[model samples]
Target: MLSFQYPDVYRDETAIQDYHGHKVCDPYAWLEDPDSEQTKAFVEAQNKITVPFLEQCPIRGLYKERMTELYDYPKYSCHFKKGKRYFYFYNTGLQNQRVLYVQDSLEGEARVFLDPNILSDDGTVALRGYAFSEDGEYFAYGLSASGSDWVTIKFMKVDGAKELPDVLERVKFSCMAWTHDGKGMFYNAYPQQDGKSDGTETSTNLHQKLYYHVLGTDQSEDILCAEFPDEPKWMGGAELSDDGRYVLLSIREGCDPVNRLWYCDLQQESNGITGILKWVKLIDNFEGEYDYVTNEGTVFTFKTNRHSPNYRLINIDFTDPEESKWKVLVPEHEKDVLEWVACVRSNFLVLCYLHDVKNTLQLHDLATGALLKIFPLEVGSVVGYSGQKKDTEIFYQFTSFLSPGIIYHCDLTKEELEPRVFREVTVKGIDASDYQTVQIFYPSKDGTKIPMFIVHKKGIKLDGSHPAFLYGYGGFNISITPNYSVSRLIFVRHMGGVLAVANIRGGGEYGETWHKGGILANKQNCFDDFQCAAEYLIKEGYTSPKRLTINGGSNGGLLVATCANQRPDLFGCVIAQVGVMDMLKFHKYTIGHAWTTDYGCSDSKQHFEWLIKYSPLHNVKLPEADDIQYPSMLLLTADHDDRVVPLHSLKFIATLQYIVGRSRKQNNPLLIHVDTKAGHGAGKPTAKVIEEVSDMFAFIARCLNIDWIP
Candidate 1:
């Protein structure tokens, strides 16, 4: 009990860094070295306290059982076709991982294509990206251990399902491309290894190189296709034409949404791809996302936001390869944002639009870019889409706060076509009719009308005392839409809690302009928007400050932490998972520098001035007034989280504990929960996910003092 009151790790008082003459001391910087003995002890100590406290919550096991029961339903992903076969991933109830399945037709017998659960005993090892050869003779897949971004690729014969001798290693954030004849493939990876390859290491990856691997060849024999010698942070990717006439290479700065496009014509490859081939710069700069859609000979089409922030489709002729020659194929939407683009039958484009955050699916002619038909849709998100240039039919999955999954298969051959329900998910003992979801527009501090979705029991009264859980993610141009979640359902059903998702700024909900409003110099708008959202819930009698809980992860993690720092009294409980806390030194870590667009880099004077104001770590202080106390917070991070790094939470919790936890007026608990063998929450097994949900909800329940009725 005494140990929970204060952190056991020692902070170095002398550790400091000067940013453009501004002196800042980072005393807990020692925790950045994850492998250090002191850091190891710090992690063990933090978890030792957190785990026992979570165990003390009586509803933890109850929530776990109920959540498991709710989650025990067969799941199917959108299926796509290659050659004559259709492939999709399916998972039995409570399986460690989803199993890939293949069929000759929609009604044909399904057979297990690949099972990832058998790859490892505990299912910590997972599959990343996979693609079948154009001829369907071979399948290339990438495997990752412990949810890390690092992948080791393997080859297999699709006919016999036998593993091939060819293996590729040292791959991270790779792009898979299969050649037309199935003779070889193109992929990208890092050429050099850093200090450690484990996901826990905070080393920055540099100089991503693209390579060409032939069938049954050693990785050392792979032909080096391209490498950016000067730009160590630039990641390279390969894109092949459906006809295999040309190859388009993508060059991006870390995880930036935009890229530089270049192309090479196979017909002009006189020497036959013996080494690095000559590439003509198509889109010379990363002005916007000039995403390659499809191509015919010298003419290529792209879904881009180059000048249209709302996004549209355009055509460019590689023969000329000039901006002056580019023509608009699909004009930008007047009021909506283009969410995603898919193809059907090599002659039509299935354009998905975000109309006020809900998806509206439309089909357009590829030749004229004319709206041929609009697909009827429910008020939900298009969670999955599977189709390519050769197929006249496509499959898309729709999901909402009430609906789990409904896979629809639509054929474009009909002039007035309807998307037929291919598979509808059925969860026993669960009824969506018992609940309701409502969307409302709320004003932020800056008077921006932010959209939000509130879900609860169909006819329950708020009464101003019901416990409410609010979630928001306001960064990286990612939109937050209404989606079904097992844990959130448990929070609403078992705990009688109301869950709300605010489609705040710093998201592409309203396209680039809306996203720009919450980033860089306007970064504080995200915090203000979220805080105002919290106030709206209270003002509307959804929940009071004493019973209000907030949650987010990654960029959203940064959002919750910043909001907690700025308006701690607004929320009773806070959960910041895998947040980028130490903004001053964030760019020094892996892929962190890429976030300079939204969170301006500290390298610039203007950026440092703004970042210092809201950085979760830099702004931690004692309560503003004697009566106002910080919220009970769970600073959650995993040991293997290389994306944002666990050091952010480690340094943050230590600072919070020293400043706010030790305050006399503070009674609410503050702790850090660190999980092992997990990265920033990708491909985590069902067992791990269930345990994490249980522990996290337990913390929330304990903090808000709410309990399970069951």
Candidate 2:
């Protein structure tokens, strides 16, 4: 809650715009240009403040040391079988990134298949996505630098690590699919930007085209399969049906729960070398989201929310081409949302559902949707799973608040469909018995019952004097399910801070109904629910206002910033990491257009009114009284964050400094911690993640005036 000599930051008061004739001013609009030398100078001056301020904290190194120790443990992902080889990701303690390993069998000796650590000196290069050809002859993977979404696809033979000459560039938000013949692959990408791309620029990503790449050719010679030239915002991903008979194309305009489905008959067209093939427009309307599950010859089954808010499985036979003949396999659950469905062992179905916030897995008969097995599960989420339509065995990874993870192996061939623990992850000194997690239902502003999960040390006193950290992400129909976090464990164990996650509205916790309750006009319900979570923690003596810290990243960053603006006195510290602060202009940059489905575009009058009401930059007003200043704010953003863009934090921080933080009555410091060679926090090196966590905790400790328990 302190600072040094504040910079006399410059601003353009004339930066005004019209949202449907409603005038709005963006004073720090100049900060939108990342390449400007003046903006770089501003970044330099701001970092100078945060860097020294952090170095002065005595507990910074202490937290890093302990966190490193806690983090130095073996981690693994569920083993997936492709062809005859079993593959999984492994990280030995503190490796910068997980190494992909392959083996002949479960009991066979494992060997390193792809070591991304060797590809870069700083471990900033990450294996973004990967897929093996049908016969496991070639493995294609996308590599991203500095945690950017921009990917460069490369190929390697799985047999002996023989690298291929094939490389696809300028790929972002794309999915890689290999043809059954293993001759080439299908992927989506946009035309390369005018200049160099390093994952930092805020240029909008548009005109995605699906292309087919031969096994040994340059991206320039790749065949353009399907593209949407008229609709520049349309995103298309190619998926070869499991039967290898149909080439499915899913087209979506934004990040909404809706899409248009298209398909091409690979059987009729013949796999000859050619340009764009003819397509059959199946579902031409954006009614609901449709996910291709598995298919029989001409009958395709999909897990869709079309007229089924909880999501249902329906079969579409191309021969019929009529709605009357479509059959609903597994009907929508009464209350549960069907999360995913997997066809296993040729004829069986493995369905995972979100019952409340916890996951429920079931094995069913693929043909009739008859439940055969209700797999046992606790209050946790299925973090990962590996299975194919023909495999008799499957592995699933599960995690809860107190435990790291456990991989369960199930053999569908056996009549007894039981899953046994194949691997269990454990930290060095942490014990599940020493901690406790409880999910509580608390009422929000308008009598909406919100679920919040609270985790802490086993026998902590609820004295309202302890420090508490509340986290929430209530947009994009994404539910914050139970998962493990090393830093969260450290917070509860060492700092005695309460780890509270509210299953707020806008998430698919209760299916599409709940998602709609907190999306667009109902978006305020998310903030209210999050705020109520903090209030309940304080009301029940878990922590008080001055001891509470609200944190989130990306869209959650938007949540944190907006809530802090509305109720600055309700929190002690606010941490917004790469949040969309400029709501009115969010859709103008990068894939921010995709988010307009949830946030609504400012170009429209109704959405602009809704945005200006809660846009963090617009609603940031001085506190009602002089003593009630903005909370000790720590905004973290990176140079390569093209998704939300660094300009968000730049403008918000500048505005805060210009208005709230500069006042004599404002004692709590306003800080923006900016880092280079980093994007929107996806593929960070272990050291970088450790550094950020420890630095963040150090700031929280300093603000709350608390010491480590140990």
Please write out the lDDT profile of model 1 over residues 261-351, one tens digit for every residue.
9888877887777888889887878888988888876788899988899999999987777788899999998879998887678888989
Error of 1 at 454 (Å): 0.6
Candidate 2 stretches greater than 4 Å from native: 1-3, 270-273
Q: What's the TM-score of every candidate structure?
A: 0.98, 0.98
**Model 2 per-residue lDDT at 122:** 80
Clashes of 1: 2
Q: In angstroms, give how far residue 280 of model 2 lies from its true place.
A: 0.7
Q: TM-score for candidate 2, please give it.
A: 0.98
Give model 1's TM-score versus the native structure. 0.98
Query: What local lDDT score does residue 479 receive in model 2, on the 0 to 100 scale?
Result: 84
Best by lDDT: 2
